Amino acid sequence: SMADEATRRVVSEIPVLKTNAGPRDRELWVQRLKEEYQSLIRYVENNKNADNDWFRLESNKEGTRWFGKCWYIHDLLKYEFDIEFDIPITYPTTAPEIAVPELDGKVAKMYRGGKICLTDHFKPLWARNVPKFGLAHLMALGLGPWLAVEIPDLIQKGVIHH
């Protein structure tokens, strides 16, 4: 299967997650947060090594609100966008909805408030992999490919500028 090989090529060096726990799940949530941070930091480390260091994230104390920045390079110009998301109560079976608030209303493949609209294939890919995928996988398989289509289109239309 091309889809299965494409997934593996993107995520094979991201630590797999284990714990089925969302924000309300106490010691099991603290455990899932350990898996989340090790998976993210290994992903960042791999990104730096491949000259593709494209985002920073932090969470609140409880790990229920995430925010940071992504950088998208086009014709050697680096574009910075603020990102944020809440962890759904039913995480990790339900995927979080990444918002890029400054692009709110400017992209067709987006909901009111700047929540990105991921392709019909991302959600069943997430669903098939529960609970192995985490925030690192959301960034690699969700936001990363959305930027690689939407940012170049916004620049060409002159909707955003350096």
Name the class of domain 2-156. Answer: alpha beta
Sequential DSSP letters for the chain? -HHHHHHHHHHTTSPPP-----TT-HHHHHHHHHHHHHHHHHHHHHHHHTT---EEEEE-TTS-EEEEEEEEEETTEEEEEEEEEEPPTTTTTSPP--B-GGGTTS-SSB-TTSBB---TTHHHHHHHHTTS--HHHIIIIIIHHHHHHHHHHHHHTTSS--
The active-site residue out of 10, 44, 117, 155 is 117
Contact 143, 98 (CB under 8 A): yes
Residue 154: name the closest of 119, 112, 108 by CA: 108
Active-site residue, 70 included? no
Neighbours of 39 (CB within 10 A): 23
Q: Where are the domains of the chain?
A: 2-156
Q: Is 48 exposed, middle or buried (0-12, 13-18, 19+ CB in 10 A)?
A: exposed
